[PDB]
Design an enzyme around this catalytic site. Sequence first.
Site, short mmCIF file in Angstrom:
data_model
loop_
_atom_site.label_atom_id
_atom_site.label_comp_id
_atom_site.label_asym_id
_atom_site.label_seq_id
_atom_site.Cartn_x
_atom_site.Cartn_y
_atom_site.Cartn_z
N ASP A 224 -6.95 -8.53 -8.34
CA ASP A 224 -5.50 -8.59 -8.47
C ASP A 224 -5.10 -9.83 -9.25
O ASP A 224 -5.67 -10.91 -9.08
CB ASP A 224 -4.85 -8.60 -7.08
CG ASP A 224 -3.34 -8.62 -7.15
OD1 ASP A 224 -2.75 -7.60 -7.55
OD2 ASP A 224 -2.74 -9.66 -6.79
N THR B 190 2.51 -7.90 -11.31
CA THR B 190 2.17 -9.29 -11.59
C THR B 190 1.33 -9.41 -12.86
O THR B 190 1.75 -10.03 -13.84
CB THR B 190 1.41 -9.93 -10.42
OG1 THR B 190 0.49 -8.99 -9.87
CG2 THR B 190 2.38 -10.38 -9.34
N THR B 191 0.14 -8.82 -12.83
CA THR B 191 -0.77 -8.88 -13.97
C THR B 191 -0.10 -8.40 -15.25
O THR B 191 -0.18 -9.06 -16.29
CB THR B 191 -2.04 -8.04 -13.72
OG1 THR B 191 -2.62 -8.40 -12.46
CG2 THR B 191 -3.06 -8.27 -14.82
N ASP C 220 -0.14 -4.86 -1.51
CA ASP C 220 0.36 -4.27 -2.75
C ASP C 220 0.57 -2.76 -2.63
O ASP C 220 1.17 -2.17 -3.54
CB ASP C 220 -0.60 -4.56 -3.90
CG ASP C 220 -0.64 -6.04 -4.26
OD1 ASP C 220 0.04 -6.83 -3.59
OD2 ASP C 220 -1.35 -6.40 -5.22
#
Lengths: 527, 525, 526
Positions: free
Chosen positions: C59, C92-93, C390
């Site tokens: 993640d 996020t990524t 998540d």
Amino acid sequence: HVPKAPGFAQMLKEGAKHFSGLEEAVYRNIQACKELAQTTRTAYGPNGMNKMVINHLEKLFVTNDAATILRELEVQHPAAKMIVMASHMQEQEVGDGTNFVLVFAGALLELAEELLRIGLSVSEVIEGYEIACRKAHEILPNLVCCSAKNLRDIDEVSSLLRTSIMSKQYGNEVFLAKLIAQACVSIFPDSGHFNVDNIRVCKILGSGISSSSVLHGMVFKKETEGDVTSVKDAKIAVYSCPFDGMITETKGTVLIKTAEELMNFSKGEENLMDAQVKAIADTGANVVVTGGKVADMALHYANKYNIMLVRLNSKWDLRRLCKTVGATALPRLTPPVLEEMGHCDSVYLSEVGDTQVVVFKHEKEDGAISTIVLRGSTDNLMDDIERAVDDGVNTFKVLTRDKRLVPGGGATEIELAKQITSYGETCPGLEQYAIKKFAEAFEAIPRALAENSGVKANEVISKLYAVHQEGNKNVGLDIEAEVPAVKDMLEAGILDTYLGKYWAIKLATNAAVTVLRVDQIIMAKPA
Amino acid sequence: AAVKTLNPKAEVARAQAALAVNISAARGLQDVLRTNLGPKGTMKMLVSGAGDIKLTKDGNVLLHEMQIQHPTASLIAKVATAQDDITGDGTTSNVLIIGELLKQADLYISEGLHPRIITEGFEAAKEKALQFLEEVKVSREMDRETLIDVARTSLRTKVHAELADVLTEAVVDSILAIKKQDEPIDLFMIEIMEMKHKSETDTSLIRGLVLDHGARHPDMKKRVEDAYILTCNVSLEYEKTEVNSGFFYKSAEEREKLVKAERKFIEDRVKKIIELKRKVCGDSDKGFVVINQKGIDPFSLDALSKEGIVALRRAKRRNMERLTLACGGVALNSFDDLSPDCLGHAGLVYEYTLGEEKFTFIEKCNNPRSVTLLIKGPNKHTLTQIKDAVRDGLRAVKNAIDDGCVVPGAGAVEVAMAEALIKHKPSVKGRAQLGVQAFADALLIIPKVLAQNSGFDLQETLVKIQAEHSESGQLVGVDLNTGEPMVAAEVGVWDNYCVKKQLLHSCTVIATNILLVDEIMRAGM
Amino acid sequence: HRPVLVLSQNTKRESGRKVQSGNINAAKTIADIIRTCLGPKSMMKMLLDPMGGIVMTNDGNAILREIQVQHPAAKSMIEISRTQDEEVGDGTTSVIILAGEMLSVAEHFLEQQMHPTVVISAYRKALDDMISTLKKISIPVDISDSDMMLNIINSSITTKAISRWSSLACNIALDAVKMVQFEENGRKEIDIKKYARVEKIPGGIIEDSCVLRGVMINKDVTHPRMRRYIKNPRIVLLDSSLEYKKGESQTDIEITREEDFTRILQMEEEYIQQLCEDIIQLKPDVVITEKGISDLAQHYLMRANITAIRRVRKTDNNRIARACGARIVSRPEELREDDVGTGAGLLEIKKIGDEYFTFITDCKDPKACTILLRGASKEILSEVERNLQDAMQVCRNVLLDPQLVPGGGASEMAVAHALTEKSKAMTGVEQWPYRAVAQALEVIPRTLIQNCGASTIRLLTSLRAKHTQENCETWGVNGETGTLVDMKELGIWEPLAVKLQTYKTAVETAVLLLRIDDIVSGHKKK
Ligand SMILES: Nc1ncnc2c1ncn2[C@@H]1O[C@H](COP(=O)(O)OP(=O)(O)O)[C@@H](O)[C@H]1O
Ligand SMILES: Nc1ncnc2c1ncn2[C@@H]1O[C@H](COP(=O)(O)OP(=O)(O)O)[C@@H](O)[C@H]1O
Ligand SMILES: Nc1ncnc2c1ncn2[C@@H]1O[C@H](COP(=O)(O)OP(=O)(O)O)[C@@H](O)[C@H]1O
Ligand SMILES: [Mg+2]
């Protein structure tokens, strides 16, 4: 508590580093050569700025030519040395356009990173650049509009040499074009090999650039040791042996056995040296130039028979004097000279800039050699003009080899950017992306001319493609004032070194290809 | 590297680099722990920084007490910690499967293939191996002679087979007298005491309890027969008030009236005990033993010694649960409802001192449901051999009772599981054909290590074992004496079903995660 | 020694092109770290922390939290992924790669003598059009459908490490949010951090992990006489202690008579019997408090057959108050019938690996649950715990905004053709940086094919041609195989709140880092 990562498979270095992959080796060679392209981008063009560069010897080098900047910067990156040595080969081949290699190959590697990170690898960027490089050498004979063939005199080459002067000396573009015209044309070999070594620069500290001139001969920085400084006949006898007598080479030893051999030895040495100095006074000589030392007895009879002595401690300056007056350096002591004498018009001495010089001035027979006597306020200014003078001498050697010229000032690179893009759109393959990026590398070269002139390069580069509608092929850049409204280059007279443009595209393409072939770097521990 | 740009003191490992870090560290733990698997393994002497000898060869004690500082060695030690926590045995065999799942996959990833394609074949092989384990399990209805052979296998792999015959009768007979009627067996009801009396081959099973503390008064009885156990949690010692008060007296004669008054609340608790000894028809011996978890002051110990009541002090927390089941009384926290119904019973309560260290023994109970294995090892390191083997053997017989099926022995499971994956290897129909082959060769290390530790050939033994399995239907295995293929279901070599079930699940997920690691780095400083 | 008269001692000054192009290379560096952790073919990244643990994850938020950088512009990109992790779950990524690419095309215009305020004013016009494009290509979701919500959460866990157990992790994460969906007054709230506790126990298999209908704690009973198995308990939650402690005063007793000291020790026993008699008037079965329980309080609860738990945490008492329907009281003499948690199912004190765990499950209608995770070790159980966080937050975004965007590259290319057609009516100097925003969005389908090994030239030409026609417009990149499959057949759908927060944070990160032309480092604070 905290663990660590040790070596894995081949960590056997004793203090050395290792780079492999596209990110660790290929992309880091691009970003290192990108900083050298942004370094000399400011000093490119007629509106370029100088750079005070201090080397390891704590001396000052101020210039706007990118060739002498890289010689003083101690670059340690290995791929950055490939673009430095490629610019050094431009100086050795044609002597002009060394800043063109750093801009073009710096833009080739910069647009190569925009292709490896978007798509195909280096197997097609290298093959894509070499296709467009071979087509770039086909448009360059089609872009030749004028030639340096008709009326090779001092009037026509003054305007043809303005482009190499105004790129480094913008305000002194008119006076330096006349000094380089009276020196290069006067040493013409009557349709033969043009030598750039036959033009010397004597830096005399003093007044400004308006007092500079070109003298037909050679100007040294030494003395006479005599009183025969006024010579008008100028019959020069050149010797390479020291003018002090003739001693043997093995040991040398005087052997006296009686009183008659001791008392007559001193008077016998003076009569031996008197017969040798008077042997050149009967032949009509006035100037005797030696290479080695001179004894006190040689100066006694040189002032007695009224002949001037010139001491040249340098042996390369002695060979240039033989090509000046047309003499032969004699390795033996003073013979009766039959036909190997020199013949000048006026050899005198004068103190110019608190520096007593010896001038071998040719009045009538002016063309044997040329020397440009430069006058400057600082010693650093005379080095920058000498770099601008030597670029003008190397430009005259280019016009001797190839008399063709292309319209510079940005007019050539836009037409090269248009024809290569036409080859890229008609390429039915995946390698057409590197061909279109090869034409955009020509787009950044007039972009550096507009950024140094304080003009917005987006509006400058938009008007260049708008006026290049398939039939003009000559409009470059008008960088004399803001709000450009750019005009023709053949009317302004900005065209120089078609052969300089031929080698600069070939060397910068081979420099960018050589960096892209490097996929794995193994360096050693530096010391 | 990108991590070297932002943090210059941060080491990193790339894709082909971090795989070689984890594989070479997995072979490092494999080559150490493969010399102690099975009964023919070698002992290991583990010396710490202090200088104490820890002589053991269990896979969990070896990985914890080893001077290794590696991130890959810490990942296998976390999986090996949970193996010895829930089911006991299966820790040494856990590391060898992980060491072979990365070594057999190293031959395919280095030969052009991707690590994710190997992990797709591990899941397809784990599903067939889990269904094959449910077909080879043998249900024997939890016979007490079956539990002997289950405990004999786990005890022989930790001792030199002279104490294994003694500890089998101390583990199987201790696990049967705890719970009945299909009740979950609590392992906290068995106390493990360490003695030094005779020798290592003298560990007996005390049917009651063994306490590590004795009577704190010299006038108390040392040997009490037919006693009443009164388990207490009250504080018989002097305790102050919670509100700090302090005494106030005028004369010196009024000072002694306050010392008598401050012990009156303490002596009322002692009068509740000595009246309970009179209300149980005390015209006989009628011994009384109070374990008394909280401490007792010596003023109350002198009062109970004159009445003939043995009083202990400072017991453990779980001693109020093990002795409550053994004596049959009620663990009380107050003396407001004292009655003979809360009293216990034991036929013999005696003490014995081993170098100024008394041990109170409680024996002769009817239905204790709580026992104590009395380990009497001579040395300190010999006590750790038997303690690590008792808790390995007690968790082995606990899984054979909770699960109704027994899994076969040494080579009767792993050889048949690898041959079942070859016939289902062309059933995956894709690029994961070589993933089932890497999983089948990794399961064959259990007959390979046991043939190597016994001194026999590694490759010549595996040919004859797979020949006897393919030419028959019997689950044949490895013999640690002759090397011939012998069936494990008939010679008395068994194993647990939950051990082989968790060995197929813990080793598979930890191998598919390690092979997909490519950025081993150290940042945060 | 005479000191040198200087100004601003021990600090640095840096300005010009070294800071404008210097913050780009610091942002491109973090984009190359998590570039191989975006698609479904991603790989784990083992990290080492100074505490001594090991973080093996893929993640993008958990990777950047363990990286300590010294560059100030690199510290800004770490706080971007922390903002995306707290707003949405699986967003996020994608922001760090997109903010690195929008700054990658912004570095090209800074070399063209363009002011950074012109590129930002073109970025704000492009930001307002990316939000309007996602609302036109969205699709309404039926939140009452069970199988429709399973396909949304499966699209978020295909990237993570729980894609192998997709049939189990989808049912756990969906049932965890639907139990904690609490609404007392006229306001719907979903609290998956205070009420959805994820307890991991090392051991067992991952397939036996399931969401319990109730809570659990790692606490044993206080006394062995108390029952460990109650079918229908009446759980009463306490907050104060059941002991006798020193009051908040300066109380001191002067003991003069003999009967006074024995009376104080009896009043301490009678005070415990007073509060123990007040809690048994409602006839409970399980007494749970947050403070200590004395042995005298255990004596009255033993003969009343009351199972007492001693030292449950404060965060666990608020979670069991919603599961059993109790009210946490702090006064034993003020107990009422509405403060008793009736409706709790089977209470059993089980043991998992030589440690007792109090299970309060099988509730009628609980408002808080506990996901019981069991795995091989603590290393991979922290991975499933971070992946279920998540997986539960992406189900919270659908229940608050039921709109789906076609992910897997179909979302980024549908707006990249919308910004290209809208840029033809600009006719200004902001037209060229407006075109670079549409080319910067293409890095998300570029990363899906670089991770699976597909071609980046032959696929981007065919995918850009699919968005020329206005008919389908939902064609993305299949990260499993490597070809172009329509997202109406694969089932890869991302929520609107994930895609809106991705574009809003990637642009405003480029707004902040482009206005920075100076950096002063070397000063101290108070
Ligand atoms: N009068 C002018 N008007 C416009 N451009 C000019 C003029 N004179 C020179 N230039 C430009 O300045 C540049 C100078 O390049 P230069 O640094 O001399 O290359 P190199 O380093 O290879 O010698 C040329 O490319 C030319 O286009
Ligand atoms: N008497 C025996 N004969 C053959 N094999 C045995 C015997 N006892 C144990 N083994 C084998 O030794 C292996 C390891 O046993 P043990 O060391 O107790 O567990 P672990 O290796 O997991 O710590 C088992 O897989 C079992 O098949
Ligand atoms: N089966 C699939 N096919 C194509 N793309 C996928 C598939 N599964 C996931 N993706 C893509 O992988 C990306 C993963 O993003 P992620 O890193 O989870 O974002 P965040 O960091 O915000 O959680 C998603 O944007 C999604 O488009
Ligand atoms: Mg020039």
